[PDB]
Amino acid sequence: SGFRKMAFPSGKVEGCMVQVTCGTTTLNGLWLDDVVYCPRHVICTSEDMLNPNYEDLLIRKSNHNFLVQAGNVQLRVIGHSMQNCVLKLKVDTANPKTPKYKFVRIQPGQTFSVLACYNGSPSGVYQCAMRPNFTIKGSFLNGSCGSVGFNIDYDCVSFCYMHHMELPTGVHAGTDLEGNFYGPFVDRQTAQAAGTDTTITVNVLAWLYAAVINGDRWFLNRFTTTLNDFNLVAMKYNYEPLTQDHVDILGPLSAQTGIAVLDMCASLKELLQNGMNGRTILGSALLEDEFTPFDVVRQCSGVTF
Amino acid sequence: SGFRKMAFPSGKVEGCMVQVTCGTTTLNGLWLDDVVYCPRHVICTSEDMLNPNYEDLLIRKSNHNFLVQAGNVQLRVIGHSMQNCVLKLKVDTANPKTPKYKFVRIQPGQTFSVLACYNGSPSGVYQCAMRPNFTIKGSFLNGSCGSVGFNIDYDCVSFCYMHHMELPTGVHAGTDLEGNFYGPFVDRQTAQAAGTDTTITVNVLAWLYAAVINGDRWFLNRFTTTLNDFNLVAMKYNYEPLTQDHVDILGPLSAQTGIAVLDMCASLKELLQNGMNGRTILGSALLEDEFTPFDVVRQCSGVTF
Ligand SMILES: CC(C)(C)c1ccc(N(C(=O)c2c[nH]cn2)[C@@H](C(=O)NC2CCCCC2)c2cccnc2)cc1
Ligand SMILES: CC(C)(C)c1ccc(N(C(=O)c2c[nH]cn2)[C@@H](C(=O)NC2CCCCC2)c2cccnc2)cc1
């Protein structure tokens, strides 16, 4: 028993992290087969950040302008190209540690693990969610750019996020591994702010089920509710609409605990209206929304990789 | 910026996890050089748990009674011995992935990462603390036994914990890698409960500094306090005594932020007496005590491994 913010084991991603240097800027890159993927803003200078002309900047660059280091080993760059906001550096050595992998674009509300890196070296791993406003609330310092987010399914690493930058709000923004930003953000130093975020209702519900599985049951009330009446209340507290797909997705937790989803919705309704009155749920004084239903199932059933 | 519960990258420990089977019981083992370390209760049966005679049970066991699997590869056991509550199985193949490592016994209040495993396969990684009552608040299911906790310093993995069992309270107990339990607990099915836990005051203070570094400053008041007056208040709220060693250890955070430790103590005093009044700190509605000062420094300075 117990419940923790649990990340995927990071060993498969660790063997893919390299350091990419271009002029004075260093950041991280991802090495899969004989390609290194990293943020294109590595080719910016301090004179370039407000409105870089990325095509023009790249043109003045030779392969030899790119210094790629895997640990202490230099990898020789033999090609370079730009795909959306990502650079692809073809190198003359394929990564012998390339895992089975794919590139996916995740949906707001989904979660992934982040292997934060600096100068090509791993520093820490933590679990994140794609917020409804397409930001993530990560922990990243200067030089973290190129750190990646991933899920693991079985033996296959699905890469979903590459870190590009921090917004003035202190939240973080980036791209899928095709270089397309999540949200309306751009890789230049300009005014751009996140939309108002919202609470991932289906995740909050998944977490309430995890509480019940762990024996924390005081918030369960005697009522039910309709989907429509639940959503009118939740709207007021800045919760996202719960759809029938969300309900279906909560099926495994409802079956395990015996609590119908609409019944759990009535308990959450009461928590929103009345608060928790000093009590805690799974050691938290707040409703948590960064566990998906699948995360709860996986952590309370022991899925390994 | 940002602040997360951040674990150490787990790749070095992943390459050390094996499956150990003895009769019908399976659990995890740690493979370093040509030795596999695992909990001795693997040699128990369902008829043995109340008061196992471990010496007698081990005697009736041959090397061939131990099935060790690294992935799908069987490792042949060529010796076996018992050290305190841990089994040491000498195998005929040394782990080619053995990292530089040592075994340490940690102090209450310190933190470590846990690589939770099932049947020798990694499932997730999260960060934990040794509670003052020598339990840990982990996330572990049946078969997690033998999962280990560790810190990483530079290139060296310091192993500090091996998971042995769950208490009826749902908290977890285990040993150092010499097989000596943390706390008064024993590896048998008998009545044994944790002492009353307490809050790790020096950790709470480290977390308040992390808040300030991240720009969350509303709880800072205009007062100072003496160490003695602070501890009289903290005693009431079940906080541990803050010692001068704790103050010295907070030196780097005080220097970085400009806030004297005793000044930060006056702000924490007010939070204990008045509560937070609906406000949050680093996204939490509760005071967090599972970040050590070193964790804060490392996460707000980017130390890599
Ligand atoms: C050129 C461009 C696109 C404007 C840029 C500039 C700096 C960086 N940041 C690098 O740390 C970094 C950059 N190159 C190597 N390191 C940081 C970053 O985003 N500050 C933004 C701060 C608001 C104003 C725009 C820039 C950063 C800090 C913390 C976590 N994440 C990233 C990222 C992008
Ligand atoms: C023989 C002995 C020492 C009594 C024992 C028995 C079972 C286990 N548990 C194994 O899961 C397990 C054991 N062997 C393979 N798996 C579980 C465990 O501790 N239940 C305790 C529950 C209270 C009463 C005593 C046993 C476990 C569950 C969840 C997380 N951690 C461990 C551990 C030790």
Swiss-Prot record, chains A, B:
Activity control summary: Inhibited by pyridone-containing alpha-ketoamides compounds 13a and 13b. In turn, alpha-ketoamide 13b (tert-butyl (1-((S)-1-(((S)-4-(benzylamino)-3,4-dioxo-1-((S)-2-oxopyrrolidin-3-yl)butan-2-yl)amino)-3-cyclopropyl-1-oxopropan-2-yl)-2-oxo-1,2-dihydropyridin-3-yl)carbamate) inhibits SARS-CoV-2 replication in human lung cells. Inhibited ex vivo by michael acceptor inhibitor N3. Inhibited ex vivo by compound 11a and 11b.
Residues annotated as the enzyme's active site: H41, C145
Cell compartment(s), UniProt: Host cytoplasm; Host Golgi apparatus; Host nucleus
Position of the Glycyl lysine isopeptide (Lys-Gly) (interchain with G-Cter in ubiquitin) cross-link: K5, K90
Effect of mutating L205V: In strain: Zeta/P.2
Cytoplasmic compartment segments: 1-305
Enzymatic reactions: TSAVLQ-|-SGFRK-NH2 and SGVTFQ-|-GKFKK the two peptides corresponding to the two self-cleavage sites of the SARS 3C-like proteinase are the two most reactive peptide substrates. The enzyme exhibits a strong preference for substrates containing Gln at P1 position and Leu at P2 position
Domain Peptidase C30, residue spans: 1-305
Subunit structure: 3CL-PRO exists as monomer and homodimer. Only the homodimer shows catalytic activity. Interacts with host FBXO22; this interaction promotes the proteasomal degradation of nsp5.
Function text: Cleaves the C-terminus of replicase polyprotein at 11 sites. Recognizes substrates containing the core sequence [ILMVF]-Q-|-[SGACN]. Cleaves and inactivates human TRMT1, preventing tRNA guanine(26)-dimethylation of tRNAs. May cleave human NLRP1 in lung epithelial cells, thereby activating the NLRP1 inflammasome pathway. May cleave human GSDMD, triggering alternative GSDME-mediated epithelial cell death upon activation of the NLRP1 inflammasome, which may enhance the release interleukins 1B, 6, 16 and 18. Also able to bind an ADP-ribose-1''-phosphate (ADRP).
Protein known as: 3C-like proteinase nsp5
The organism of origin for this protein: Severe acute respiratory syndrome coronavirus 2
Phylogenetic classification of the source organism: Viruses, Riboviria, Orthornavirae, Pisuviricota, Pisoniviricetes
Gene that produces this protein: rep
Location of this fragment in the whole protein: 3264 to 3568 of 7096
